Amino acid sequence: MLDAFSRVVVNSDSKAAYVGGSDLQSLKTFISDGNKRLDAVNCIVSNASCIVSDAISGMICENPGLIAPGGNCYTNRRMAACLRDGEIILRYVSYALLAGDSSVLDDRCLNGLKETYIALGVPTASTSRAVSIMKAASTAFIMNTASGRKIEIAAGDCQALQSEAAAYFDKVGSAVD
């Protein structure tokens, strides 16, 4: 379980040197980018069942063979575990947006999921589709470009942090594929 801080500390431990100036300077850019990250995590948290519901119902609408009889969404409890799993994916992505480092997301869920879904028969392309929908939806909330919600924040550029969030979702989507 490693943040930005523990990434710098672990790398400086492998080098066995002290922390110094430039690494801390990049971490000063992290601290100065702090409140943007705080408001970003607040935006992704305050739209949870929003993103999960739209994302998974969009996944079914893209490929309707899931709700077809014999599919993996075809049972009520299977839809329940489907919604729950999408929710937990969004949860660890939110933890990775707090942390600034994807080590927590690598340790919670990303390790051992592909072989699990092979063991259960979950279609990995459909999960990558759902993670892609949560990616574009979440970045659309993080730029505040949601076409159903426009909340008040002061103006600033957050394209880099948005690319960071897209890096987490692309890490999940690359992980399941």
Partner 1 sequence: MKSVITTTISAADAAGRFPSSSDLESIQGNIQRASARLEAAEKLSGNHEAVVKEAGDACFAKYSYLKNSGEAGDSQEKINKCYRDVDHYMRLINYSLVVGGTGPLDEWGIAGSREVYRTLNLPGSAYIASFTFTRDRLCVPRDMSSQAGVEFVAALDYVINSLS
Partner 2 sequence: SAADKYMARTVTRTAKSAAAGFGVYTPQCTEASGGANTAEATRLAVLAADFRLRQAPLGARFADLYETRRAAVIQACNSSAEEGYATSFPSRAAASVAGRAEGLRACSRYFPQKPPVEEYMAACVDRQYKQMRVHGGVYSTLCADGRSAGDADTARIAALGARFRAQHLSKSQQTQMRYNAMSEARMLARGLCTYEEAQFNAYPKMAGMMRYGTGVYAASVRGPELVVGNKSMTVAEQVNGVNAESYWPSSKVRPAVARGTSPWMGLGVVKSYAAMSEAAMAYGIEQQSKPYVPQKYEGWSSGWKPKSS
Partner 3 sequence: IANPDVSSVDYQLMPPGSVIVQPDEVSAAKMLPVSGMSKHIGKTKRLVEGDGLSDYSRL
Ligand X SMILES: C=CC1=C(C)[C@@H](Cc2[nH]c(/C=C3N=C(/C=C4\NC(=O)[C@H](C)[C@H]4CC)C(C)=C\3CCC(=O)O)c(CCC(=O)O)c2C)NC1=O
Ligand Y SMILES: CCC1=C(C)[C@@H](CC2=N/C(=C\c3[nH]c(C[C@@H]4NC(=O)C(C)=C4CC)c(C)c3CCC(=O)O)C(CCC(=O)O)=C2C)NC1=O
> Can you say how many angstroms the Cα of residue 85 is from the centroid of all Cα atoms in its chain?
13
Q: Does 61 bind ligand Y (CB under 6 A)?
A: yes
Selected binder of ligand Y within 35, 145, 159, 163 (CB under 6 A): 145
Q: Does 137 bind ligand Y (CB under 6 A)?
A: yes
Q: Does 26 bind ligand Y (CB under 6 A)?
A: no
In angstroms, give the least distance from the CB of 136 to ligand X: 15
C-alpha distance across the termini of the chain, in Å: 24
Q: Does 156 bind ligand X (CB under 6 A)?
A: yes
If binding means CB under 6 A, how many residues of this protein chain bind ligand X? 19
Of 23-31, 37-45, 128-136, 163-171, the segment contacting ligand Y by CB under 6 A is: 128-136
Q: Which residue is nearest to ligand Y (CB)?
A: 61
66 in Cβ contact with 74 (< 8 Å): yes
116 binds, among ligand Y, partner 2, partner 1, none (CB under 5 to 8 A by kind): partner 2
Buried-exposed string 92-121: b where 16+ CB fall within 10 A, e elsewhere? bbbbbbebbbbbbbbeebbeebeeebeeee
**Placement of tokens 């970045």 in the chain:** 139
Of 12-20, 33-41, 77-85, 130-138, the segment contacting partner 3 by CB under 8 A is: 77-85
Copy the structure tokens of residue 22: 């430039």
Strand, coil or helix: 145 = coil
Q: Does 123 bind ligand Y (CB under 6 A)?
A: no
108 binds, among ligand X, a second copy, partner 2, none (CB under 5 to 8 A by kind): partner 2
**Placement of tokens 């492998």 in the chain:** 14
For 64, residues 6+ apart whose C-beta sits below 8 A from its C-beta are none
Q: Point out which residues bind partner 2 (CB under 8 A).
A: 1, 68-69, 72, 77, 84, 87-88, 106-108, 111-121, 123-125, 177
